[PDB]
Design a protein around this ligand. Structure first.
Ligand SMILES: COCCn1c(/C=C(\C#N)C(=O)NC(C)C)c(-c2ccc(Cl)cc2)c2c(N)ncnc21
Length: 264
């Protein structure tokens, strides 16, 4: 009942990319020509009428830093068809070898791009609710794109903002918090934040006012930007417009005398 509906013969499932509770994720080919990604759904872990919403946001939303939807199959088992991102998740990309050599200025440019994606999500009055390195996809030329916004609002503790973790206040300002934590993944080669702490002690420590220290060999001005992202009051945090502009211009405006180090 929709112009995103497609018959099942167009999609050749080729290669297996990731296991999940929702279901698998494949590479494939659409109509013989195009290389495409395919998120699937295993019958007994979610209903057909429920997974309708995963791609409702994707239907309405289009921007160069948002993984693009090509197609769906609403009849169960469901398949969602998107652009294939060659280099996989951003987290896998930073941890493994291809980013052993990534220095600050490749990282800051990635951040500027994700932030472009989110400033568009801001401008359209949506919320991601789940921004972190495992949901960013890297592409050819280190193009980064904001990915799994299934259950993205129309109005995981370590990444989540506390007012959201606790009271369910899931705003665009709780995405600036996350994004601030995403800045600490980039600059530590994709480690887990709050190292040597478990989900339980995180919430307590955060509300006491413990923010993460400046990761080794990272410019002070960037660690400051992380602390603006994690201000206690939602409204004292900056927006995806100012972040985008800040990181784009970073090396001219804010760090012109920056010198490379060992890790950044
Ligand atoms: C090998 O890890 C990259 C797998 N991957 C995925 C899958 C995930 C991501 N991120 C995911 O759910 N978790 C990972 C298994 C950890 C997608 C994808 C994203 C959104 C939709 Cl709607 C359809 C598929 C994807 C893509 N478009 N291109 C290349 N790789 C992709």
């Amino acid at each position: 009942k929709d112009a995103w509906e497609i018959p099942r013969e167009s999609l050749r499932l080729e290669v297996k990319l990731g296991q999940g509770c929702f279901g698998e994720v494949w590479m494939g080919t659409w109509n013989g020509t195009t290389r495409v990604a395919i998120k699937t759904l295993k019958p007994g872990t979610m209903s057909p009428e429920a997974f309708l919403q995963e791609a409702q946001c994707m239907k309405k939303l289009r921007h160069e830093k948002l993984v693009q939807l090509y197609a769906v199959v609403s009849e169960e088992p469901i398949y969602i068809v998107t652009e294939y991102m060659s280099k996989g998740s951003l987290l896998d990309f930073l941890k493994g070898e291809m980013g052993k050599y990534l220095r600050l200025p490749q990282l800051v440019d990635m951040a500027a791009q994700i932030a472009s994606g989110m400033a568009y999500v801001e401008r359209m009055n949506y919320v991601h609710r789940d921004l972190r390195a495992a949901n960013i996809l890297v592409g050819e030329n280190l193009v980064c794109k904001v990915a799994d916004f299934g259950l993205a609002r129309l109005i995981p503790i370590k990444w989540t903002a506390p007012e959201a973790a606790l009271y369910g206040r899931f705003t665009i300002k709780s995405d600036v918090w996350s994004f601030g934590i995403l800045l600490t993944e980039l600059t530590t080669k994709g480690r887990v934040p709050y190292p040597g702490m478990v989900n339980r002690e995180v919430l307590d420590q955060v509300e006491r006012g413990y923010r993460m220290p400046c990761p080794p060999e990272c410019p002070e001005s960037l660690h400051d930007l992380m602390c603006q992202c994690w201000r206690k009051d939602p409204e004292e945090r900056p927006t995806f417009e100012y972040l985008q502009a800040f990181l784009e211009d970073y090396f001219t405006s804010t760090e012109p005398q920056y010198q490379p180090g060992e890790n950044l």
